[PDB]
């Protein structure tokens, strides 16, 4: 899956200018930009509907591709189960009851799997759209705003279910979406699109050096606590007058506070400061917005 040197013009409006893209050792990627910059256009070009690429796209024929773009596509007069079955037989390899049943109970569409799609709401149609897209058993998933009409609990269960199929079946996901607090729950990296070209690629696992975790302890217990932390993990900044020591961000506090509770140390307070994707977006985009 590669894209090489893509330029697309609509009349006098230039959308794409020599873009390269590659899935390198990553499974879920995020696409971020402003409104009308051409993200769905990039998605559409990598998918295949547009034909005048003027460049090179490397796709193996044996790999299947499933997608959801701007709007759900379903048969309105017919039921949902008929739609799932038809697109599994027509686009996918076939239909299997166990696989569709696991999808239906995990997604949560059992009470309404037999109602007519015409009576559904928009969020109901978006969930149906994600399930029909996944029915293809694809090698690449191309989703355009999958969570723009769902309740928060619905967003968490659908993303967790998507991740579960990512590990149980070798899958690569490309997701373009706003609401970065929802994207950050399950994603490995994000790429920022601005003015028609890629500018920044951020890997969230490795982090930035600005993240800190602040632990405050008693004055009498300060020497012993500092000794244990100096032995075990890395120290970036140390200031005794405030009593705060800056170390690298750690996700689990279990082992750390377990060790201090074993050494009779009880911290007064603990918290962490980290930079999110909203912060990265504003820092990159303030050059043209602020």
């Amino acid at each position: 899956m590669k894209l090489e040197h893509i330029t697309k013009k609509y009349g006098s409006n230039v959308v794409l200018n020599d873009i390269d893209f590659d899935f390198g050792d990553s499974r879920i990627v995020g696409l971020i930009g402003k409104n009308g910059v051409g993200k769905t256009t990039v998605m559409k070009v990598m998918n295949g509907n547009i034909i005048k690429f003027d460049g090179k796209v490397d796709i193996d024929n044996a790999d299947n591709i499933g997608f959801l773009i701007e709007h759900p596509k379903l048969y309105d007069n017919k039921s949902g189960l008929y739609n799932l079955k038809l697109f599994a037989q027509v686009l996918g390899k076939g239909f299997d009851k166990a696989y569709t049943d696991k999808i239906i109970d995990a997604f949560g569409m059992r009470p309404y799997i037999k109602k007519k799609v015409k009576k559904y709401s928009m969020g109901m149609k978006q969930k149906l759209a994600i399930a029909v897209s996944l029915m293809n058993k694809p090698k690449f998933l191309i989703l355009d705003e999958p969570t723009n009409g769902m309740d928060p609990d619905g967003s968490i269960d659908v993303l967790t279910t998507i991740k579960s199929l990512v590990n149980e079946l070798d899958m690569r996901i490309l997701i373009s979406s706003h609401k970065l607090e929802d994207i950050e729950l399950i994603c490995d990296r994000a790429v920022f699109l601005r003015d028609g070209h890629f500018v920044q690629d951020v890997n969230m696992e490795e982090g930035v050096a600005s993240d800190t975790t602040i632990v405050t302890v008693d004055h009498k217990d300060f020497d012993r606590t500092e000794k244990y932390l100096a032995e075990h993990f890395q120290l970036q900044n140390v200031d005794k007058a405030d009593g705060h020591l800056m170390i690298n961000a750690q996700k689990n506090y279990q082992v750390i506070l377990k060790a201090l509770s074993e050494l009779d140390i009880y911290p007064k307070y603990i918290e962490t400061r980290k930079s999110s994707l909203r912060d990265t977006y504003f820092n990159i985009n303030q050059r043209g917005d602020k």
């Binding site: 998918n47 295949g48 509907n49 547009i50 034909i51 005048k52 024929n61 591709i65 997608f67 773009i69 709007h71 596509k73 379903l74 048969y75 309105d76 017919k78 038809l86 697109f87 037989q89 027509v90 686009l91």
Partner: protein, 251 residues
């Protein structure tokens, strides 16, 4: 690719399933059958007061006319379903699916035409069994089947090309009805008038639209060699043009 063959056959089977599972299909069959049966009982069995003899040419032509205009509208609806719901974006992804899509649409056209020919055969045979007269011939029914196939196939490919070019659905339904009913309506009121009428009347035997619509309501039909050559060549050219357009359009 046999896998692609299975994809096309599954789409044609499901298209036929959606045709066979609607109430309008049987409302239309009941209306046409009731009208033909009512007309035949009321007028063929009591005019000159014979021994209930009926001449089957008028019933043949009337059944052919109603079934052709209904099968044509069922074909226009079938070919415009995907543009109506907008799900066509999911099928026009890669070139191999786009071509298997066109092959599947053509096979669907062939099966719908065959099914309607069988419907015509069953209704007329029951009517013939009930009434009294001189029976028709199987060679007539097989050549009639060919006429159903050629006419419906021709108009469906033409309307498929126009609907591909325009992406509008109302225009296709109006244009289909317009093309069927304007030529027989205009020719008696205008063609016999000029000093160019004989030339245009002779040229009406070469325009495919013109002679297919003129010969649609006839109770007898034998084709000339030039008509066969033009119709088959035209069918092949529309198919090739459809394939060429489907591989270059972008949504």
């Amino acid at each position: 690719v046999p896998r692609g063959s299975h994809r096309i056959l599954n789409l044609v089977k499901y298209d036929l399933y959606s045709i066979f599972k609607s109430p309008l299909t049987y409302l239309a069959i009941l209306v046409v059958s009731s009208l033909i049966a009512t007309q035949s009982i009321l007028m063929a069995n009591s005019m000159d007061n014979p021994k209930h003899i009926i001449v089957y040419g008028s019933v043949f032509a009337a059944a052919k006319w109603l079934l052709l205009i209904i099968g044509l509208m069922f074909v226009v609806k079938t070919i415009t379903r995907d543009f109506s719901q907008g799900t066509i974006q999911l099928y026009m992804s890669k070139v191999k699916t786009r071509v298997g899509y066109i092959i599947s649409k053509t096979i669907s056209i062939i099966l719908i035409s065959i099914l309607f020919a069988l419907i015509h055969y069953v209704i007329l045979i029951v009517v013939q069994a009930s009434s009294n007269g001189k029976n028709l011939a199987f060679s007539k029914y097989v050549d009639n089947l060919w006429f159903f196939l050629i006419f419906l196939l021709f108009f469906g490919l033409f309307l498929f090309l126009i609907t591909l070019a325009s992406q509008k659905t109302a225009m296709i339904f109006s244009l289909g009805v317009f093309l069927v009913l304007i030529v027989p309506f205009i020719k008696p009121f205008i063609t016999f008038i000029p000093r160019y009428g004989e030339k245009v009347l002779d040229a009406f035997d070469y325009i495919p639209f013109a002679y297919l619509t003129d010969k649609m309501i006839s109770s007898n039909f034998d084709f000339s060699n030039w008509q066969w050559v033009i119709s088959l060549g035209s069918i092949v050219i529309f198919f090739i043009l459809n394939i060429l357009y489907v591989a270059k359009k972008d949504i």
